[PDB]
Point group: none
Chain length 27, copies 3
C-alpha cells in the first residue's frame, strides 16, 4: 500500500531569550 | 495494501524572539 | 504501506521575558 500521510506538526519551540537591559534611569 | 499510518510528529519549533527591553533603571 | 514522513516543525516559541532593570541614573 502507499505511504501514509505526513505526521502532525511538531510542538512549539521554547521561549526566546530574555530581553535587553532597560535604559538608564533619570538623573 | 491499505495506505500506511501517518508519520511521526515534526520537530519542535524554533526558539521564540527576544523579550522586550527591561524597565528603566532607578533615579539617582 | 510504510508509515508516512515526519510532520513539519512546530511554530516558533513564545517571546522571551523582559530584560532586567536598567542602570542607575547619573
Amino acid at each position: 500500500g502507499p505511504p501514509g500521510p505526513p505526521g502532525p506538526p511538531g510542538p512549539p519551540g521554547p521561549p526566546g531569550p530574555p530581553g535587553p537591559p532597560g535604559p538608564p534611569g533619570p538623573p
